Amino acid sequence: PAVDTAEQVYISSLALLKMLKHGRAGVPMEVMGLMLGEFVDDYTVRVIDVFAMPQSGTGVSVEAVDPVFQAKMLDMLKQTGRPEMVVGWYHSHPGFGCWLSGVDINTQQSFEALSERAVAVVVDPIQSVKGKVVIDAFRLINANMMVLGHEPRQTTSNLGHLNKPSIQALIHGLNRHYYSITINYRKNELEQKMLLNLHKKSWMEGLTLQDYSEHCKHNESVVKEMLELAKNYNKAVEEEDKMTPEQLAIKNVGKQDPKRHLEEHVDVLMTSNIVQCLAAMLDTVVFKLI
């Protein structure tokens, strides 16, 4: 019964944010926690929620799992509608990629003895940027099976080889002592609409008019900036006429481009004045005494 390469680990929206928040706050400690969820089948591992284990002391490494903290947190989470078993553990790798070290391999073996399908999720809060989180799910490769000449997992699909392994992970034992499980994200309409409220400006701000004294001064200063930029823009036009195509860009390094700054000033000023004008016009009839 070899595990399938098409196995997927599903991380909920709540779970992903908790490890990112816990991992970032614990930078650079390899802060660990337990992933609650359910092994739906031989091909799916759902991570409904996670919770963070405390750090026993100083040291940038994964500490031993505290059994009293785990058991009495699991017991107390069951009271508020979370009767979900532990499907693995997560820990942070603050900036040096997502892989498993020697200590991480030993920690995973503790989970593998209890649950054979335990998943080691590594999250990189430092390398994670907006729209792309550096995450990976790992499960150990048994040395006895692979040494004798057996692949760690069967490949009955194309699903598990869509993500090219990183060289940093391949260096640190990927595909040698552990394998990567493809991570898919479970997002619903409800949670997705709720997250859309982030940075949603209040209705008061839309109709609020900017101070006209500062608006005119900003109008004043930026227009004065184009006065010098236009003077420099004229020089840039003549200079580029008599100037070789190898220096079309090299000569632009270290020297400001009047054309680029003129566009930015025009773009900034056009939205500043149009919005102020439209907001003033809307407020004229919306807030009327008659």
Partner: protein
């Protein structure tokens, strides 16, 4: 001996710790970005621990950085040169 176990166990916890690179803060770029220079080495654009004060990290402050991430771990007092330490702790002879 019960005390022998405590000292032996203390060593095991002490073995898991890793040394930290000693540097010097040059300038704080952002709230979470710092420019530090190694004592004998290059200058790096590093981060800092959230739990740290970030107000005691004035430019020129000696700091300890993580070996891997180079994140600032703590701020240290001005280093006393061992030669200078031997200068102060030199016995005159009760003359």
């Amino acid at each position: 001996l019960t005390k022998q176990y405590e000292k032996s166990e203390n060593d095991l916890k002490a073995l898991q710790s890793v040394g930290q690179i000693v540097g010097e803060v040059l300038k704080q770029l952002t709230e979470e970005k710092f420019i530090v220079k190694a004592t004998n080495g290059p200058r790096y654009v590093v981060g800092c621990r959230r739990q740290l004060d970030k107000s005691k990290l004035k430019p020129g402050t000696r700091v300890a950085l993580d070996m891997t991430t180079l994140t600032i771990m703590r701020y240290l007092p001005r280093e006393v040169d061992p030669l200078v330490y031997n200068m102060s702790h030199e016995d005159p002879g009760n003359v």
